[PDB]
Amino acid sequence: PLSETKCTLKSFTVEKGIYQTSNFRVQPTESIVRFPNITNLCPFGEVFNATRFASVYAWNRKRISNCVADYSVLYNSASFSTFKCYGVSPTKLNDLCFTNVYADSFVIRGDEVRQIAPGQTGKIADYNYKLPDDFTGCVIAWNSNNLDS
């Protein structure tokens, strides 16, 4: 403690008195994690497997809840191309526990794929489908040149 006092006073001589050096914290151990009892596979697999899509004038809306969502298996897949996930991290999807999930699926042309992003205008962006000024999940797009082509 005398060495700490000499450090905090930046001198080799200290006069009689009471001095403050630092503060301490009790190190916590034995971390605990709790979770509910829900146990059922989620139908997002059939959402992504099945490809019967619509277009912009009528975009499908699906509700995803009461699942055990696994994004790591989809993340490592090379079938899809663009993740570019805003808000939450693409790799940190498995350590935060969500409240509700919204799914939208449709088909768009290749010159407007970049137009689907918050805080920007365009032609099909500002007139047909706007993303709000805050984070809303993220968007995944992939090339299909054998079904609708």
Add this chain to the structure above:
Amino acid sequence: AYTNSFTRGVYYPDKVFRSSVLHSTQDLFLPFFSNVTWFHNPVLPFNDGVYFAST
């Protein structure tokens, strides 16, 4: 048959527990000392929420 609903329409806004604290909140509450349209099977408007007191 208008009636003065004095101080009815107070509900817990959130699923949180508090104690001995004066909490200021903002939500769709029924204004105090309002007038309610007594009725007696007509279609009625639903603006943003209906306080359906009944006997």
Add this chain to the structure above:
Amino acid sequence: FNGLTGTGVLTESNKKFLPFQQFGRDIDDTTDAVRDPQTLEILDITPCSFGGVSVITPGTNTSNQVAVLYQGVNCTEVPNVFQTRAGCLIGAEHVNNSYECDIPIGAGICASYQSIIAYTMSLGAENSVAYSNNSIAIPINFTISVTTEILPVSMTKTSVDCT
């Protein structure tokens, strides 16, 4: 707890919840009571001890040993222990005498060299004047004393530019 990450020490809570709450709080936002998602009970959260550290030294020139005081936590989890009303100090021998004392600590307890002893300060010498309604005390001799005091009037004049 279901995405709620928090540090603290848990205890069997004594407060009561209505069947529709999930967690309580207090002034501002201090989550204290939480309901577990599986076994359906209630546990309250309180901080574990923390505080600053103080060192009492009698001067390097005089001696080369010091005392360590912990403000906040009391000496139950700190891995010549003495407990006071303001933290606890280790390294000082408690005595049962009162002296007009050196370096103060707090709540009337003050420690000084003698080998670093901590005690309760004494206000001063106690005497009782023998009051009476039929006697007065008159001085017979007088002395002339000289007293000094220092007062500052100004400091250095400094100017600082911007560009």
Add this chain to the structure above:
Amino acid sequence: MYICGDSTECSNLLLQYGSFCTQLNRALTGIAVEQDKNTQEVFAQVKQIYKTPPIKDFGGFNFSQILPDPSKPSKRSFIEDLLFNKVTLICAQKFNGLTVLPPLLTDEMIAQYTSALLAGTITSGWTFGAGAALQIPFAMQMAYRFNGIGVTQNVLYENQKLIANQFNSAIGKIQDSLSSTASALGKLQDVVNQNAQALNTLVKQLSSNFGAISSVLNDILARLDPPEAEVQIDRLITGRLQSLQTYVTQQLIRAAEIRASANLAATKMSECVLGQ
């Protein structure tokens, strides 16, 4: 602790802002150490500690309402008890680093100082401030105090009973005024309210977005990439620094006037009680 709650890389980012963690602590330490000298200067003016004699022959005056009472928790008198009741072990700490330090001078020694001063004034006149205590009857002290304002000393020695009765009635009348009027102490309550509201505002300002995504560090840290979370961890430190600086500045400004009032009170105690 207040700015970066139990986080590591938050301290790493804070280390790039110079040393904006020590001067605030130094100023607060100076305020705390000065608040001890403020109390030490006023009361600690008598060298010894006198106590009242068992003799209660004061010529007619009744001082039992203000002298210390042995059958009390801290040997306090009636007026001190009334004053204490009219103003509204170690667990004090939060998740913010708010700490309250106990004063050096406990209430018992303050009461002892006041009792010593009262006993010296009663049983030694005004001679206990210059040299040593010189016992003298109370009646002659009152006569000299009358003589010091122009009125001759033969007025008191022939109207002693009337003055004793008037003083007793005046002493008795103050208890009702203190007990009934709850708005008498309008000067010892403003500072407490101001300090409490300032601290409440300081602790309440934490839950603010400040333009970031969330007002809590842990939730942001567990969601964003550290390569990208650098900007979002920022815009939060820069506001808390401003809040703390404003609080410290206001504390200094309001402590200056308290110190001035303490100096005035010390002057009043030195000049009006020890002498005339």
Add this chain to the structure above:
Amino acid sequence: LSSTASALGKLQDVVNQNAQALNTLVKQLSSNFGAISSVLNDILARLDPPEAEVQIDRLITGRLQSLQTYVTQQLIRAAEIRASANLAATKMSECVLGQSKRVDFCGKGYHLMSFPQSAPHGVVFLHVTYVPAQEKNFTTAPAICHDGKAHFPREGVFVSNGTHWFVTQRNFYEPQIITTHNTFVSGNCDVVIGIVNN
């Protein structure tokens, strides 16, 4: 004063505070403040006006906050120094140029006079004070009545060494025989408490 040092604590504290404040201010000039480097010449030399301005803005705002804090602290310290100077001026004007009757203003006891002396950044006073000692206690009496007339003392107090009565001043022991030159009559000795025959 020659040998015992450390009695000039106030001036040393003021000088140390000023020096520490200035040192901290000059030391604050060497932080990144979120930029790339702590010197603007390097940033200008390694970059171009297109984007070199952001780091410059960060450095400017940080230095501006530091300067503002230093100025505020200096203002507070100057106000305190002004208050101390006012107190010193009042003391010098009232005690040096005259005599003080208020208790415990200049010195500890009955004030006599003072001498001022200079200092590196202040002033030092040398008060001369009067203090009694060698006390002796006697048997007193408020007033003495002769021939039914209650004489009171003009200025002083009645005392007795055991057999005789004298009148003496308050702050010294100079016995004087009781005569009609320093005692005045008022009424009759039937209402005063403490009347003693003489």
Add this chain to the structure above:
Amino acid sequence: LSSTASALGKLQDVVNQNAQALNTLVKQLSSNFGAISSVLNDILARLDPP
């Protein structure tokens, strides 16, 4: 009093100081502060929200 001027130094100095402080507070409204324009009415209607 009626002949010598500048005798009311303290009051005039206080009034001048207060007026100067208010004036220099008012003047700060037109500073660019690093934006694209000093006034806000045009800046809100000229650029996109981002």
